[PDB]
Design a protein around this ligand. Sequence first.
Ligand SMILES: *[C@@H]1O[C@H](CO)[C@@H](O[C@@H]2O[C@H](CO)[C@@H](O)[C@H](O)[C@H]2NC(C)=O)[C@H](O)[C@H]1NC(C)=O
Lengths: 48, 49, 44
Amino acid sequence: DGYFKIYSKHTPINLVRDLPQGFSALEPLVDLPIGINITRFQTLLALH
Amino acid sequence: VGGNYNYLYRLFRKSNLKPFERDISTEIYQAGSTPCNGVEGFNCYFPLQ
Amino acid sequence: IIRGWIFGTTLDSKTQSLLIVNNATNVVIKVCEFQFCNDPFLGV
Ligand SMILES: *[C@@H]1O[C@H](CO)[C@@H](O[C@@H]2O[C@H](CO)[C@@H](O)[C@H](O)[C@H]2NC(C)=O)[C@H](O)[C@H]1NC(C)=O
């Protein structure tokens, strides 16, 4: 409905192989009002 | 007196706009089998009016 | 290294697109019709 909603959570994990087996609900952050038809996306990292 | 043609409205589009959505792109509308690679005419039209 | 995201439709100047950057100490959400690079990364 033209509302980009972002939820997140930070969890101290102990595994270094796969995602941990557990429950951690992601509390919301933002509900920004953008009006695009998002179809694709991409990540942005840093190159020092 | 001129008409105040500064205000524009979109007239040509292929899909019905979703609620609270904005279409600013002014790309040439394609209304036929013509590829419409710019230079509109007889099948391609300016989206704005 | 993982800082942000670029949501969009064509990821270029023909259509609008979002851009989140978690750089410095503030997030930089910004929506324009950016001309995104073939290989986007943060200059640092
Ligand atoms: C939602 O965004 C999508 C992605 O551009 C649009 O889907 C296009 O719809 C047209 C309809 O004529 C198709 O010809 C295209 O092939 C579609 N693009 C794709 C599948 O990538 C859609 O029109 C947008 N809707 C609104 C209301 O803006």
